[PDB]
């Protein structure tokens, strides 16, 4: 609430060209000290704001989380059904591929998370499972009876097949096109996104 | 064929020290010269071996590309489906993330392929596109027809669709798992990848 928060705003600042070092260096390349070079303040005051590399990355972490899930709240909310909500994914994901990667993409060495990171991917995950309410029978759907505590409400373990289905499924074309993987392969991946989608959709 | 090609040797040991440095620091972050401190040789020496490090870099990618396409072609040679075909790119996947990442994951800024990587990607492809022969109505085969430059051997458009949806739908899983999303979820990723597999095989 407090007026020295401010400091929300120069944070800020810091991520922002926290996000410069990961698009031109990569993460782990990434440094506090160039940072404070690059703002011209001390080393030190840069800490005063992030105590290490793992803080700062731990928030681009939550940041990126967090966007990901307005994104597709606001296509639930719109009243949208699976197909709205894998649209909300693909523009998210194409508005912002090195945000897409912090999360999705190669993993940065050395960084391990506090719990949260996965405690706060949840929240994307709990409206496509909201959606495919929209048991049956098959081996994964058993299995997934005993295990689902990443949701005690109250959905057939078939909706939450699904609703992994549509993450990996559409995950699996979005950042092999962002990886680069159809460049030179001269289709348009939109379109196969757009029949990966409609394959899932109440197939 | 010559003897003075030991050079080969020391480019595989040079290559070696450049996945430690992937590792650890990340691409981008990977330098010859720290390469040539750690093995004791002239910073020029190293670069009589790569012009530079994108030199390394595409050497590194091709490599990368060689080895899923031996493992994919093994599994057709030893006349497995599908199915075979799957759990030949798990392995591959599984048995060297960093490799899978340098491919599939996040692009190394700056760094731009000779167009010969995928030139050297429609290898792995060319085998699932035969499997697929194991034309089929819908408008993202319709396209195909139109825009298949990457495959002039003979397969209904169905067969490229479906092609490209095991790749998408497996890598979907396969970098989900790796890029760590499924932690803290619970259930055995390995029966979702099992999952989707069956779905997609003549579903």
Redesign the interface.
């Known amino acids: 609430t407090p007026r020295e928060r401010y400091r929300t705003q120069v944070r800020a600042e810091i991520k922002d060209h926290a996000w410069e070092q990961i ?7 990434l440094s506090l000290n160039a940072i404070a070079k690059r703002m011209g303040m001390s080393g030190p005051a840069l800490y005063r704001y992030f105590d290490g590399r793992d803080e700062l990355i731990t928030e681009l972490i939550r940041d990126a989380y967090r966007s990901q899930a307005d994104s597709l709240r606001a296509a639930a909310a719109s009243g949208a059904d699976l197909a709205g909500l894998a649209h909300a994914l693909r523009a998210w994901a194409l508005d912002d591929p090195q945000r897409y ?1 912090l ?8 960084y391990r998370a506090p ?1 949260d990171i ?2 706060i ?1 949840a929240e994307t995950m709990a409206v496509i499972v909201d959606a495919c309410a929209a048991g049956t029978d ?3 759907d058993a ?2 009876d005993t ?4 949701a005690d409400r109250p959905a057939p373990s078939s909706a939450l ?1 699904r609703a ?2 549509f ?7 979005l ?2 096109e962002l ?3 159809f ?6 991946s939109a ?2 996104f ?3 989608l409609k ?1 899932l959709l109440g ?1």
Request: no cysteine; proline share 5%.
């Open positions: 698009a031109t260096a990569g993460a782990s390349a990667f999360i999705f993409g190669t993993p940065v060495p050395g719990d996965t405690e991917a098959g081996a994964f299995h997934l295990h689902r505590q990443w097949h992994l289905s993450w990996s499924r559409l995950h699996g074309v950042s092999l990886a680069g993987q460049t030179g392969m001269g289709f348009d379109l196969l757009e029949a990966e394959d197939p």
